Amino acid sequence: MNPLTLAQEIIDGRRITREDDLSFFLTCDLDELCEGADRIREACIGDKVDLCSIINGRSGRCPEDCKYCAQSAHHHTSCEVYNFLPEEKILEACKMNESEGVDRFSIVTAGKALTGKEFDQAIHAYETMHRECKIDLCASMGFISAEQLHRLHEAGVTSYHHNIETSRRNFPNICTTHTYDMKIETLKKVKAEGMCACSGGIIGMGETWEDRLDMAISLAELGIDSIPINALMPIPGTPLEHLPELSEPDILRTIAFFRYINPEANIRLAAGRALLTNDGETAFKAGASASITGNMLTTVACATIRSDRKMLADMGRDVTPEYWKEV
Ligand SMILES: C[S@+](CC[C@H](N)C(=O)[O-])C[C@H]1O[C@@H](n2cnc3c(N)ncnc32)[C@H](O)[C@@H]1O
Ligand SMILES: C[C@@H]1NC(=O)N[C@@H]1CCCCCC(=O)O
Ligand code: SF4
Ligand SMILES: [Cl-]
Ligand SMILES: [Fe+3]
């Protein structure tokens, strides 16, 4: 077995399982694994690169203890602190991302879960966006209930984001206040609601190569539709502030095997894209088919949205959103 023929087999319908020799993806040649991942992406996704965007709808004060997170109240960081934003600020950002041609937009909230009056405020914001704007809609709100997921879906939200973060084995080393099992339960609810599930995690936090493979396999078993691969941005004041940043070859290997293991998913670049040369150009040629663009939650964009769209179009990818296709 070799990466080039294995990519052909997957194009022709083979699917990697937990019982396959996953160590192959660690020992095989990187450039061949990238080439094969790009071919799998071309066959299963095609040339569209889906671009999404986010707003930090509620910043800081989270009681959870995730070791990477700027917004955990267990850490003293530079993060802004505010309760759920006024609707006008959300609509301003939605309209801006639509003016720039982004495919979808998400409200992302710090906290264990968004509940009660602030949840109602989010719903109202989605109703206004669904009425006024053509850009598609996502939410990332923590451990919400099935009834809340249905309310989001009825208001026009089509994807729910809930990252597994790390492998099951490594999860207790990153967070003690909630569990990996709790993440999987939310994801099952997202699928039962008929929404797209967007779930990935963070690499470079000290997890092993085998943990990264287990993340990829676990998301494949769930049928996850969109998989954000964040490289750690070490945040000053958090426990992980002094971890070394990942190299481009290590990120590319990860993107590529996530593509082999999740051939039909959008493998999506997310935080840490500045670690890649040319703001991720090579990753789009190594299995990635989607990216978050523009500003993140407490850190700034690696480039403007326009720069990302021009880079992708110049390499021959399609970045025209559906709402700009008039005829
Ligand atoms: C989506 S959560 C917000 C909603 C909710 N509180 C939750 O945890 O599901 C924000 C996402 O940002 C990513 N993230 C946070 N801090 C990061 C960092 N320093 N480097 C890379 N990714 C990070 C994590 O993967 C996390 O899932
Ligand atoms: C929510 C978006 N979806 C995802 O998987 N990561 C994004 C957020 C990245 C945050 C990077 C660190 C920060 O800005 O605090
Ligand atoms: S639950 Fe979400 S906001 Fe809270 S510390 Fe963890 S990643 Fe950050
Ligand atoms: Cl756990
Ligand atoms: Fe603490």
Side-chain angles (χ1 to χ4, degrees), residues 1-325 327:
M1 161 210 321
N2 78 76
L4 303 173
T5 55
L6 176 63
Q8 188 65 56
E9 289 175 357
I10 291 168
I11 289 167
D12 294 332
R14 177 172 178 179
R15 293 291 179 260
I16 299 299
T17 76
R18 191 176 284 279
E19 290 75 46
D20 278 300
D21 165 36
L22 305 180
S23 79
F24 168 78
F25 293 115
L26 312 181
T27 54
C28 66
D29 180 74
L30 175 64
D31 284 359
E32 288 188 9
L33 191 69
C34 300
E35 160 68 16
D38 191 51
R39 294 192 64 238
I40 297 165
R41 184 275 306 165
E42 176 185 56
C44 301
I45 302 290
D47 73 344
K48 174 71 172 160
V49 177
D50 190 69
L51 293 183
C52 61
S53 55
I54 69 182
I55 191 166
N56 181 339
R58 176 170 74 178
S59 188
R61 314 193 81 171
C62 184
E64 304 305 288
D65 72 349
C66 305
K67 282 189 184 160
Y68 51 79
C69 186
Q71 309 192 57
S72 173
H74 297 259
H75 311 148
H76 300 292
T77 71
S78 70
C79 79
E80 289 191 27
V81 169
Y82 50 79
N83 70 17
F84 191 80
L85 285 178
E87 173 156 316
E88 201 77 60
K89 283 310 186 205
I90 297 166
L91 267 289
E92 285 160 5
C94 187
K95 291 179 183 166
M96 172 291 280
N97 284 297
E98 183 171 329
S99 76
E100 295 292 316
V102 179
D103 296 281
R104 65 200 72 262
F105 174 70
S106 190
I107 307 174
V108 182
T109 58
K112 189 179 199 174
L114 190 63
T115 310
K117 272 50 184 135
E118 289 191 323
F119 185 79
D120 301 337
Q121 288 160 51
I123 291 296
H124 191 278
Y126 285 121
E127 297 169 312
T128 300
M129 299 167 282
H130 185 67
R131 181 176 65 245
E132 309 188 347
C133 283
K134 295 302 199 183
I135 189 168
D136 209 346
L137 299 170
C138 310
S140 186
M141 293 172 180
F143 295 104
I144 62 166
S145 73
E147 307 47 50
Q148 287 179 286
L149 284 161
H150 185 62
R151 287 174 66 194
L152 285 170
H153 200 194
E154 289 286 303
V157 177
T158 49
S159 301
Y160 192 73
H161 178 256
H162 196 70
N163 279 343
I164 61 168
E165 317 290 10
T166 193
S167 68
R168 177 187 284 284
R169 184 210 72 78
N170 191 51
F171 202 97
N173 293 319
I174 299 303
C175 177
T176 78
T177 56
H178 61 256
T179 68
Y180 180 95
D181 280 341
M182 301 171 53
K183 293 288 193 164
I184 303 300
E185 286 316 297
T186 310
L187 292 168
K188 291 176 176 168
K189 299 172 164 88
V190 174
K191 187 175 163 181
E193 178 56 37
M195 287 155 93
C196 183
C198 183
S199 183
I202 307 171
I203 59 171
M205 292 203 294
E207 79 286 340
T208 65
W209 278 113
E210 289 80 11
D211 285 326
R212 295 177 187 156
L213 289 164
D214 197 60
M215 292 163 74
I217 283 292
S218 294
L219 297 164
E221 287 171 349
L222 289 164
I224 293 299
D225 307 276
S226 171
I227 300 174
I229 300 177
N230 295 271
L232 181 64
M233 295 182 80
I235 304 298
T238 69
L240 305 187
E241 62 196 318
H242 294 119
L243 290 189
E245 292 179 303
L246 280 180
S247 74
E248 175 178 76
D250 284 1
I251 297 170
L252 290 176
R253 180 175 295 271
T254 305
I255 292 165
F257 66 65
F258 263 73
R259 170 64 61 192
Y260 275 74
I261 295 161
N262 294 271
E264 298 173 7
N266 271 126
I267 303 306
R268 182 176 300 272
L269 303 185
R273 184 151 52 97
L275 296 178
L276 299 171
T277 59
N278 296 149
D279 302 325
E281 193 203 301
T282 306
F284 296 106
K285 300 172 181 173
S289 61
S291 189
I292 312 188
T293 189
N295 288 329
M296 291 298 141
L297 296 174
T298 72
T299 56
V300 302
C302 66
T304 65
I305 296 170
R306 159 91 57 170
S307 175
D308 286 342
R309 295 187 76 253
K310 188 180 194 295
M311 165 187 62
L312 287 161
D314 287 348
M315 25 190 290
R317 301 290 189 281
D318 181 6
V319 290
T320 300
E322 286 300 309
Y323 57 80
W324 282 357
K325 303 187 176 179
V327 304

